[PDB]
Ligand binder design. Sequence first.
Ligand code: 5GP
Ligand code: MG
Ligand code: MG
Ligand code: MG
Ligand code: MG
Ligand code: MG
Ligand code: MG
Ligand code: MG
Ligand code: MG
Ligand code: MG
Ligand code: MG
Ligand code: MG
Ligand code: MG
Lengths: 143, 354, 118, 21, 92, 110, 95, 51
Amino acid sequence: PVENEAVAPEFTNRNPRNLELLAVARKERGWGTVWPSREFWHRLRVIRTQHHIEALVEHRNGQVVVSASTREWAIKKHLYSTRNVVACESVGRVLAERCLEAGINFMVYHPTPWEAASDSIKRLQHAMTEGGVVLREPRRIYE
Amino acid sequence: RRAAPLGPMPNEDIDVSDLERLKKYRSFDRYRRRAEQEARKPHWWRTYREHFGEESGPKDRVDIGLPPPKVSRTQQLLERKQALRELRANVEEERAARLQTARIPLEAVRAEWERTCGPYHKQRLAEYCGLYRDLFHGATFVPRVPLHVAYAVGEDDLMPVYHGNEVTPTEAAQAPEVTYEADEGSLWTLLLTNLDGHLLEPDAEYVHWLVTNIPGNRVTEGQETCPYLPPFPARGSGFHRFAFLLFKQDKRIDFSGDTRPSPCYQLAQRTFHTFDFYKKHQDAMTPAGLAFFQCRWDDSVTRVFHQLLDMREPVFEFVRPPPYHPKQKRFPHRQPLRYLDRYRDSHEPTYGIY
Amino acid sequence: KFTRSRIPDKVFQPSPEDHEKYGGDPQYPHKLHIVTRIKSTKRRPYWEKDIIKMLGLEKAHTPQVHKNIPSVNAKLKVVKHLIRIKPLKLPQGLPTEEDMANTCLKSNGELVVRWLLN
Amino acid sequence: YRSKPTHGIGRYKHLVKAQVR
Amino acid sequence: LASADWIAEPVRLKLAVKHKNRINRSGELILTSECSRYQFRNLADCLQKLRDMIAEASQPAKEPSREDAELRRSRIENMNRERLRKKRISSA
Amino acid sequence: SKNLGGKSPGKRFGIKKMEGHYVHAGNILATQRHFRWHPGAHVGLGKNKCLYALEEGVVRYTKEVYVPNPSNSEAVDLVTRLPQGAVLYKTFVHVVPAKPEGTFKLVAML
Amino acid sequence: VTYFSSRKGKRKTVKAVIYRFLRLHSGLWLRRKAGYKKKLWKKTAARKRRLREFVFCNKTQSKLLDKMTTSFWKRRNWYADDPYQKYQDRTNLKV
Amino acid sequence: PFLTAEQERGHAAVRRAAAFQALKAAQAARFPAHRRLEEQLGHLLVTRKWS
RNA sequence: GGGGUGACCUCGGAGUACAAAAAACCCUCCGAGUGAUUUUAAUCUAGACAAACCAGUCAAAAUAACCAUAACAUCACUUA
RNA sequence: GAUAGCUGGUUGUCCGAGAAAGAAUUUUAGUUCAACCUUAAAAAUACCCCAAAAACCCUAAAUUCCAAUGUAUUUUUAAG
Ligand SMILES: Nc1nc2c(ncn2[C@@H]2O[C@H](COP(=O)(O)O)[C@@H](O)[C@H]2O)c(=O)[nH]1
Ligand SMILES: [Mg+2]
Ligand SMILES: [Mg+2]
Ligand SMILES: [Mg+2]
Ligand SMILES: [Mg+2]
Ligand SMILES: [Mg+2]
Ligand SMILES: [Mg+2]
Ligand SMILES: [Mg+2]
Ligand SMILES: [Mg+2]
Ligand SMILES: [Mg+2]
Ligand SMILES: [Mg+2]
Ligand SMILES: [Mg+2]
Ligand SMILES: [Mg+2]
């Protein structure tokens, strides 16, 4: 027949992002006893030191996908007081832009009950939401 | 029976006597940081990473790329400190920081990021998406020079292609435009490869647009080996990856075995292997630009399958394995009445001889 | 409680004099064990009974050839107090298919291939 | 387990005590 | 579908627009039934699906209601890629 | 005499599945009265402190670090009273999924 | 269980079994869970579901019921709109 | 010992498999024997008289 | 450790039963035959623990309402 | 020919294989299950089992699950 008509029905998709985008990937349900819960595909992490602020997006395996730190020269020469709420908001906006560029749209963020009431972290979440990146990853199809 | 510890115990360094004189942390955040930092050390007992695929721990990755731009560390640090002092000298910036009303030039931030640290972030993003594992299987490169790919959806509609973006074939039907800084003394080669979509050979990938011998930045002036072909992912198995590879070369590379005809509508001819291609052109080519994006099925793929490729649109589906059921027993004990429904072939009453 | 007895590996460390005492080869170990059950299975635990059955030593005072691998050595250590173990010696080499009927096993632990020549 | 080399790894009560001349 | 003369032209166009995902490249609309083990029930189900398609294509009061739990992700990713699509630069 | 009620049958509170056993989704891996084994990846926690696998694969046990939930005041106080070099470890039970998620089979070449 | 009656000389059967059991033609016996109507307000929802759900029997009780029931109750039944007609038979029993 | 634990890994497994398959075949060949015409027609020889 | 008398007859915790499970004594000590409060805590169904039987234990996904991110009712050694 | 959970007796040969107790009971002089065992049939993994693994204040003999290896036994079905 047509030489291009062959199909080989057993198709394998070696792309690790395929299932994570199709929302059919294997979520890591589990511990429940330790915190935070590791049931997600991408995980937002806000590390606040006395000097610098880092907003990272780590995978369930531990590898960092996209990160925005105040130690970087781009934000360092453009912004003063890398500790303040303005700094947290700028880092949030930069991370939202980088996530939109990388193509990651859904991520989880589990802050402490005391850090959730902060002023910088609230504005960071608001900026991340306004930037297009929405939290609350979709529920797994046939979880 | 007791055994000997095969290495250092975790909490054996701190002393048990006089706990009150020993300093402690009183912050759950500090304890969490300490625990997360200690969980990443190569312990000697059975850990979580070893059982859940730490990717063989350390991996001797071969670095095939350009050396880093040699910069003067002292002068760079001095200029950065001077810029920081000049910035903090302003009083208006302090007023804005106090009033929480200050903005940031995101465009300049993006430019400086692409200039100084974009390559490493793009490298780790490609590693996460699995680019090098399928392009060379043993080597990861650093995209030293940038690469801006753009598709035209109309007259004023321009869609960029970033590292891992989702661009549909509706926008990807026409040939894209590439931009990257380069002098008029070098040669470049652009290769668009589809890593997912090959129907027969899973270990092979497709080629959509291969153009070699690019004089400087003029991509149109270079001779095109293979004309541009729009993406064509399957309708069932979606979210394929398409990678734009940019190689810098020193000599005028000429090849006739890899030359594609003008129509080039044969999937058998559009069967490529980046590993073999780099083995062939390893003396001259060096990868310096990388731009990969996601692509799923849409209504425009039917046109590419029917008119261009002259094929019937194949449709797949994410079918799940059947649920496990134990071996059916003769007398099920304390099992619900539906126990016979778990081994029913079809929901039709079968009348054998009646 | 009376249970199995884990034998420490130190007891199975041969001394430089045991080789010359028992006439063993210090460099190359022997290849095949000739085992012969001496004592009975009665008044012995069920696991020892199972081991002495699975080792093919039911009929007492009948030699049996076994490997020299740690797999069977574990069971031989478990029931070492009930059998006699010798190394199989081959003065005339491995018997071929033409002398399988004229072979013999002497009491000292050797396997002669040409026995009763006419 | 007691016979394992990693025995007593969860031991923590010797680190905190919760029970002048 | 293009030769089906027992239906109206707007009905045929609406069917070709809606169910184009299951139409062969030769213009042959295909229905398939495999639920029951009886070919009679299979044909009954196929004809019922055809009747439902004819009804949904003929009734003009169809507001085309769509689900949300399965389309929220698509809408979010569409808005997010539009945020980058907003770059206005002349090309070609 | 003076002691009554001292008789009570055993609850069989123990570990059911050992490391290396191939279990399916829903199998109770280990039961317990107090927190002796904590769950991990693909291992749920019932209301009676039972541990059950959620995916089909191989059972494993690993010594890992313990970061308590910030709502548990007792554990928070214990952590805050721990010295500078103390990190709590627990025995977590995991289920490594062996079966893949799904397969892409050809439906119809339209 | 009267093995030999006095009027006809046949083998009688107990009526408690036929009142609180049901014989499928595949040999299995269906019964109700003991205690599905006693003190519902003191039991959990899962316990109430387990009580309301039907259950089967084991081989010993199956043989006991087969001995206590005569040959009449072991016949094949084709009732009009019988729910258990689907369960009267067994499928895919590789034993 | 002669060999070690890492050297004896599966060195003799085809023999175990063949022995187990032979045992399975011997157990599966269990069936009532054949009933020939001789076993039934030889019983008439008990009345073989001299004419 | 013959009966009579005394004591007990059911359920749970700890030791006896040192480390998977279970294991008795008219062996030694705790207890229970419920209170307080509000988040009034459902259906259906994978697959498992325990068990002679009866009984007891869980529980992934799917359903309607509450955040559009929980529902295992909580506490009293929570186990009875 | 009342009834007996109670006592006593129960008649030819040889061969094969062959069991000492967990749970209920006006129950411990017995009954009904389980676990063993017998008779026939199906199958295939069965015992020994190194690593590695099974808790928190100190805790022995050893335990439980598993390769390979040595043997052929084990698990269901129908009667018991
Ligand atoms: N409960 C039980 N009794 C046995 C068993 N074997 C023999 N007996 C009994 O022990 C007595 C015979 O003693 P032996 O001759 O075995 O020394 C007889 O009363 C016999 O019924 C057994 O395996 N279990
Ligand atoms: Mg007891
Ligand atoms: Mg007790
Ligand atoms: Mg006395
Ligand atoms: Mg009295
Ligand atoms: Mg059991
Ligand atoms: Mg649910
Ligand atoms: Mg009488
Ligand atoms: Mg009595
Ligand atoms: Mg005999
Ligand atoms: Mg019996
Ligand atoms: Mg071991
Ligand atoms: Mg085994």
